[PDB]
Amino acid sequence: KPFTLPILTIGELTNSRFPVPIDELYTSPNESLVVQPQNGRCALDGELQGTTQLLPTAICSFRGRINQKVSGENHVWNMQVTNINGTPFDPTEDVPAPLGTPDFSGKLFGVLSQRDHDNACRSHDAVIATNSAKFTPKLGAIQIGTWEEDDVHINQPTKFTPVGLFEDGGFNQWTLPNYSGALTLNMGLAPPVAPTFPGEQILFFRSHIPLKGGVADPVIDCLLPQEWIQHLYQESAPSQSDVALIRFTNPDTGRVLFEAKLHRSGYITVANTGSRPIVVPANGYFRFDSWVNQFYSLAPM
Amino acid sequence: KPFTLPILTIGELTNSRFPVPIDELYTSPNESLVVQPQNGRCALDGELQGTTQLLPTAICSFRGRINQKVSGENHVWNMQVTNINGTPFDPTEDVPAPLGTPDFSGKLFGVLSQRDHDNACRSHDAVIATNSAKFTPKLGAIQIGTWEEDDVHINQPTKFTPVGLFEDGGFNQWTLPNYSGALTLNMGLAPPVAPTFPGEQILFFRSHIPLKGGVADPVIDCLLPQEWIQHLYQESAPSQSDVALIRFTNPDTGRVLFEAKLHRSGYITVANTGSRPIVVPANGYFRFDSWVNQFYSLAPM
Numbered sequence: 001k002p003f004t005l006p007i008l009t010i011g012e013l014t015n016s017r018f019p020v021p022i023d024e025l026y027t028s029p030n031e032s033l034v035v036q037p038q039n040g041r042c043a044l045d046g047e048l049q050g051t052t053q054l055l056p057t058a059i060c061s062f063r064g065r066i067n068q069k070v071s072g073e074n075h076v077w078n079m080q081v082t083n084i085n086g087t088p089f090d091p092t093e094d095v096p097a098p099l100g101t102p103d104f105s106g107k108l109f110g111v112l113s114q115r116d117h118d119n120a121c122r123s124h125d126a127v128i129a130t131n132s133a134k135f136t137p138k139l140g141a142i143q144i145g146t147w148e149e150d151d152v153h154i155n156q157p158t159k160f161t162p163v164g165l166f167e168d169g170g171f172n173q174w175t176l177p178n179y180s181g182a183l184t185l186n187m188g189l190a191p192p193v194a195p196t197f198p199g200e201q202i203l204f205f206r207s208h209i210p211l212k213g214g215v216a217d218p219v220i221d222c223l224l225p226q227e228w229i230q231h232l233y234q235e236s237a238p239s240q241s242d243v244a245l246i247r248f249t250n251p252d253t254g255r256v257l258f259e260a261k262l263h264r265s266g267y268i269t270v271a272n273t274g275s276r277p278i279v280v281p282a283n284g285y286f287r288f289d290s291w292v293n294q295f296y297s298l299a300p301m
Numbered sequence: 302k303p304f305t306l307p308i309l310t311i312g313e314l315t316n317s318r319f320p321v322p323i324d325e326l327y328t329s330p331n332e333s334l335v336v337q338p339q340n341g342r343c344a345l346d347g348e349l350q351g352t353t354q355l356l357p358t359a360i361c362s363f364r365g366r367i368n369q370k371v372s373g374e375n376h377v378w379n380m381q382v383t384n385i386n387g388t389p390f391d392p393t394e395d396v397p398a399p400l401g402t403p404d405f406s407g408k409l410f411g412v413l414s415q416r417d418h419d420n421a422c423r424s425h426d427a428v429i430a431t432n433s434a435k436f437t438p439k440l441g442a443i444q445i446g447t448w449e450e451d452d453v454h455i456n457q458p459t460k461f462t463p464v465g466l467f468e469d470g471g472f473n474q475w476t477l478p479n480y481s482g483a484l485t486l487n488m489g490l491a492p493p494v495a496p497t498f499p500g501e502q503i504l505f506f507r508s509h510i511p512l513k514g515g516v517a518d519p520v521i522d523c524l525l526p527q528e529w530i531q532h533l534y535q536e537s538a539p540s541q542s543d544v545a546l547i548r549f550t551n552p553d554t555g556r557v558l559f560e561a562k563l564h565r566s567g568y569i570t571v572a573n574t575g576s577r578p579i580v581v582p583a584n585g586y587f588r589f590d591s592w593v594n595q596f597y598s599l600a601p602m
């Protein structure tokens with residue numbers, strides 16, 4: 001079964017780490033950064049990893065019930081989380097946290113909504129601090145703050161729709177949350193990725209995400225767009241080597257702009273030595289060329 | 302090229318008319334309703350129709366700039382809309398409105414966000430009344446209300462992230478907006494669908510969407526889940542007849558629960574005479590069985 005990528009332009013790709021479209025391709029030196037995202041992780045044979053699941057809208061969402069208001073706390077609530085489809089999260093599941101759980105540290109801004117058993121409804125702005133000691137999705141519980149303390153009901157079906165960042169301070173896209181809280185190690189993680197081959201860098205699919213306030217340009221970089229993950233999952237084609245050579249191609253001119261290594265574990269490297277935003281034609285897309293080895297030498301971008 | 306559906310359970314499907322997961326299958330008598338959704342429209346050969354586009358998160362979103370505050374209006378703003386990827390919308394485009402434009406009448410609740418050219422950012426709750434005379438996406442302009450009038454900047458990159466309904470009153474999922482405003486007819490519409498064959502009803506993929514306030518259970522029914530549309534688009538397989546026989550199958554037991562007609566124009570009918578929520582196994586999914594004619598007699602559910 002021949003290996004394929006979906007035919008999708010940059011304007012037809014979704015970020016796999018936050019529910020927004022891809023804005024651009026991006027590459028930079030790895031430096032001292034540990035790149036270990038848990039969303040947007042999929043081996044080329046279609047095996048999902050970390051906290052990766054198939055629903056793009058569900059990335060960074062939460063579901064469950066508000067069991068109680070935080071003691072001595074105004075505008076802060078305790079949530080018992082379930083899976084995206086509302087089923088109980090089993091903490092013994094061999095995963096870092098419920099699938100779709102955010103994989104970055106920061107204050108996530110969005111809207112908390114409820115429909116009570118009697119169909120009484122409410123929506124209110126909310127923030128979820130993923131860097132907080134009270135953020136323990138792996139234990140089935142997180143904390144949610146609102147601006148107004150009065151209008152949130154207890155033990156009623158609750159959802160969180162992510163919108164963007166509350167603030168930029170403390171936001172680090174590569175710093176994983178402590179899914180189980182303080183002094184506890186994360187488990188079942190998709191491994192970190194790094195460009196091993198000399199002269200190579202990771203190529204990212206970048207989105208500039210919304211911000212509630214302040215001056216900044218917060219970005220989320222994913223290793224594979226969500227659609228590629230969805231495609232890989234369906235195809236389940238056996239990887240023939242540890243690297244698929246892919247070529248970014250303009251379908252109109254036939255011009256192959258550049259080539260890249262799509263690694264078996266689900267990330268892309270390119271021969272590039274600086275941090276730039278690639279600028280590709282709107283009609284262009286990666287096409288699978290052939291299987292090669294990890295030591296194949298790419299044409300420098 | 303053999304026709305296929307993606308292998309996806311109900312818990313792996315996204316609504317094509319609002320950016321949320323599918324909750325359930327649903328069927329009811331058509332009655333006097335005109336079912337003519339513009340999102341979630343795709344022929345079986347992969348031809349997108351109405352306002353349908355590929356990005357699930359982008360459904361019911363808006364992008365553009367706030368050109369001015371509505372005269373003599375507090376908390377109401379004018380938006381000049383662009384396409385999802387930020388490109389200019391061309392009103393001469395042979396479509397009812399910019400792709401992704403909501404296709405139902407009501408008050409849409411969400412979050413308006415901006416990043417100024419200087420990277421100054423803000424997010425604020427917002428409502429977009431699609432039943433309003435000022436809702437004219439086909440003309441490249443809509444109106445957006447906020448709660449606070451002060452903190453929205455003019456001529457700065459703006460996005461709207463949909464969350465749910467502001468209110469239930471006036472919400473009709475089958476009543477299209479007047480995309481060009483008062484006294485103007487919609488154009489380039491995907492045609493209405495209806496069960497022609499005696500004893501048949503449309504089968505829908507239903508989601509219960511969030512609500513800002515009041516007591517209600519607002520639902521959005523789509524004809525095809527977004528993933529099926531994405532799959533059809535990629536496959537572009539030629540339809541061999543006007544109807545694909547599909548069978549909802551439990552992959553574990555092998556039990557075929559029921560069968561349905563998947564029509565060439567992209568909707569499903571079933572032999573069913575009442576309005577019920579189907580209840581299918583979590584592991585189940587439709588599988589293509591064969592091409593048949595429009596007059597094939599389905600086993601009653």
Ligand SMILES: C[C@@H]1O[C@@H](O[C@@H]2[C@@H](O[C@H]3O[C@H](CO)[C@H](O)[C@H](O)[C@H]3O)[C@@H](O)[C@@H](CO)O[C@H]2O)[C@@H](O)[C@H](O)[C@@H]1O
Pocket residue numbers: 166212213214215421422423424452
């Ligand atoms: C850069 C600046 O960011 C925002 O104003 C902040 C403000 O942040 C919050 O409060 C305001 C309302 O006062 C808005 O709701 C923001 O969206 C919130 O994030 C505060 O932190 C104050 C503290 O003095 O600093 C301001 O700069 C935003 O509203 C402004 O438009 C502007 O972009």
Ligand SMILES: C[C@@H]1O[C@@H](O[C@@H]2[C@@H](O[C@H]3O[C@H](CO)[C@H](O)[C@H](O)[C@H]3O)[C@@H](O)[C@@H](CO)O[C@H]2O)[C@@H](O)[C@H](O)[C@@H]1O
Pocket residue numbers: 120121122123151467513514515516
């Ligand atoms: C059924 C009821 O709906 C909501 O309260 C409404 C309220 O609606 C808005 O204002 C409140 C705050 O006062 C909340 O923000 C709602 O989310 C808003 O939609 C008003 O319409 C009042 C008018 O008297 O009626 C209330 O019923 C909701 O807050 C309640 O929890 C409840 O579900």
